[PDB]
Amino acid sequence: DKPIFVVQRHDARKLHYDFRLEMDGVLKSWAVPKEPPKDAGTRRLAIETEDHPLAYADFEGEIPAGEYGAGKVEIWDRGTFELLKREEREIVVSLEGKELKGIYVLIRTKYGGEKGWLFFKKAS
């Protein structure tokens, strides 16, 4: 399922992937510099970005220069998810997409400034 998740390939300064989870009516968002991992074993960096409105889960097209989020946007994956766990430094979700299926984990590093998240698919 009911809440949704979206992955948008964002062609901006660099090519990266925005990973978004519907929480509390908005899309909590992370920039991932590589494709979200389809299989366990691989860890990605995920950088928290600003919330996006829910309707953004449907957006595919180009954001004009000078805007936050400027660049080319394409839907890479889309689905629903079940939230298994959520705490200040940890999020565990079961994803139901076409590329991403199964349990995924976000853990906010305690190290360092604003702190990034370790992003991976559970070995399950």
In the chain, the amino acid numbered 10 is: H
Taking alpha carbons only, the member of 111, 108, 106 closest to residue 95 is 106
> Does the footprint of Mn ion cover residue 18 (CB under 5 A)?
yes
> Does the footprint of Mn ion cover residue 20 (CB under 5 A)?
no
Taking alpha carbons only, the member of 28, 21, 46, 41 closest to residue 118 is 46
Give the one residue of 6, 7, 10, 46 binding Mn ion; rule: CB under 5 A. 10
From 24-32, 35-43, 58-66, 105-113, span contacting Mn ion (CB under 5 A) = 24-32
> Does the footprint of Cl ion cover residue 45 (CB under 5 A)?
yes
- Residues 28-67 vs Mn ion: string with x where CB under 5 A? ---x------------------------------------
Residues 6+ apart with CB under 8 A from 20: 5, 6, 7, 8, 27, 28, 29, 30, 52, 56, 57
As annotated, the binding site for Mn(2+) includes: 10, 16, 18
**Annotated binding site: which residue ranges?**
10, 16, 18
